UniProtKB/Swiss-Prot annotation, chain A:
Active site per UniProt: 126
Additional observations: Present with 6160 molecules/cell in log phase SD medium.
Oligomeric form and interacting partners: Monomer. Forms a cyclin-CDK complex with at least 10 different cyclin partners: PCL1, PCL2, PHO80, CLG1, PCL5, PCL6, PCL7, PCL8, PCL9 and PCL10. Interacts with GLC8 and RIM15.
Site, Not phosphorylated: residue positions: 159-160
Effect of residue 52 to A: Loss of kinase activity. Abolishes interaction to PHO80 and PCL1 cyclins
Modified residues (Phosphotyrosine): 17
Name of the molecule in the record: Cyclin-dependent protein kinase PHO85
The species this protein was found in: Saccharomyces cerevisiae (strain ATCC 204508 / S288c)
GO biological process terms, semicolon-separated: cell cycle G1/S phase transition; DNA damage response; establishment or maintenance of cytoskeleton polarity; fungal-type cell wall organization; G1/S transition of mitotic cell cycle; lipid homeostasis; long-chain fatty acid metabolic process; negative regulation of calcium-mediated signaling
From Swiss-Prot, chain B:
Function, as annotated: Cyclin partner of the cyclin-dependent kinase (CDK) PHO85. Together with cyclin PCL8, negatively controls glycogen accumulation under favorable growth conditions. The PCL10-PHO85 cyclin-CDK holoenzyme has glycogen synthase kinase activity and phosphorylates and negatively regulates glycogen synthase GSY2. Also has minor GLC8 kinase activity.
Similarity comment text for this entry: Belongs to the cyclin family. PHO80 subfamily.
Source organism: Saccharomyces cerevisiae (strain ATCC 204508 / S288c) (Baker's yeast)
Cellular localization per UniProt: Cytoplasm
Residue numbers of the full-length protein present here: 243 to 432 of 433
Keywords: Carbohydrate metabolism, Cyclin, Cytoplasm, Glycogen metabolism
GO biological process: glycogen metabolic process; negative regulation of glycogen biosynthetic process; regulation of glycogen biosynthetic process
Assembly behavior: Forms a cyclin-CDK complex with PHO85. Interacts with GSY2, independent of the presence of PHO85.
UniProt keyword Cytoplasm present: yes
Keyword Lipoprotein among UniProt keywords: no
Extra information: Present with 217 molecules/cell in log phase SD medium.
Protein name, entry field: PHO85 cyclin-10
GO MF term list: cyclin-dependent protein serine/threonine kinase regulator activity; protein kinase binding
GO cellular component term, pick one: cyclin-dependent protein kinase holoenzyme complex
Amino acid sequence: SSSSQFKQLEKLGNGTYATVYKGLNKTTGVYVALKEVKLDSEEGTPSTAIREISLMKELKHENIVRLYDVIHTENKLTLVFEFMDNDLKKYMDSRRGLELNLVKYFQWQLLQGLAFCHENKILHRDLKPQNLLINKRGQLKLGDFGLARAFGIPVNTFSSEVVTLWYRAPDVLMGSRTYSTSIDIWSCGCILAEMITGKPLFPGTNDEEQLKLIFDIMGTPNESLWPSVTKLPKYNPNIQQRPPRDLRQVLQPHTKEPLDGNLMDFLHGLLQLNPDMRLSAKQALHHPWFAEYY
Amino acid sequence: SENPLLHGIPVDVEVPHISVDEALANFKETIELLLKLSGNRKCTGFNTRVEKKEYSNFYMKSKPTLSSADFLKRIQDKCEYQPTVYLVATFLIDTLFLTRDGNNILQLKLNLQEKEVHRMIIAAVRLSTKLLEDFVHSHEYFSKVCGISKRLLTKLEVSLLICVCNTKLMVSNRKLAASKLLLNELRSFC
């Protein structure tokens, strides 16, 4: 855990509260990822680093990136993670829609990782392809738990501003401060669609455009199928109704691969507007689309 | 495996129906008992020099203007936190100072001194809010409440974080519960 234990190599990626470098453990000769978090004496320790570190000993799972050590130097905490060759966003950019056998295998692993989080009562709250790490062997692991949060715990504050916009659930966009596991499941649906077509399912530029894009495809909230929608602050009963679109006809044009009924059923299970009707990660793992893996 | 401090606590335990005043009292009393225990023992201390150096940041040369109890009143008067904040704060000090041995017997890991208490309270409360709340008070506001510089506040957050991050820290109902259950256990030996 000394600073000199790891050699810093090339920069890998950049975020608001961290820069990730490739690194090398000088003793084992094994690659690591060095996530360097700037420490500004006048601003304090970022909450993202503290939350991520709080999970490092407990959330251990094959489909979750391992955090090995935390190193404090002047103006800097370095979080030492297992090294992963790529993330989903770059693996795809590296090509854009993936073949379906890969899509299923990546979705399987994402949901295994997520089921373990939810079993521990932790919400990830920033699932998106960039935060899904992949290695040569095709292992996929959830990364970047900076926004993660325990649920079932008496809180005073809430950010409906969590989750990257494109992957953010409609109930959240409409001001819900009471989502639980459903928040990540929505993101998983958007990721699945993006793997199939190669394009973000709902590429909003702001909060209003995001909901507009969601309702265009999924239809407007139906108060009979979602009575609780009236409790959301930004819900508007006076918008014109729109029926759902045919999800397959929306996706199919963008891939040469046949989208079957099992796959489309699955996707509909993840992308329900009413958060209560979304599949749990555990349910989703046992959906017929995943039959072969058993 | 779980944090050894949780051995014996039902996995489905319920969040304690505890009040802010009781949360605050349990926090203070945990500190008082650790202080008591620390006067009997000569502890095995830290696994590294790193942790020793971080820990020395807690030592405050001069006597605080306010007692522990009054300082805690000032913090709560100014910040108005939920009881959960202090339960987590209590567990942070629990996990820094206590473990269990092979026979599930509680053991003191490090000596706590009175000159370390004031800055320890500052760090545990601040770290607790950042583990728990999506919105926390500004670094400026919290510093002024605690009567320290922003630079010191940062130094204290990181010192406590480095000192406890080798233990299992994930916020959960069982850790909330443990804060009170460990106090009862300590209480029973003193």
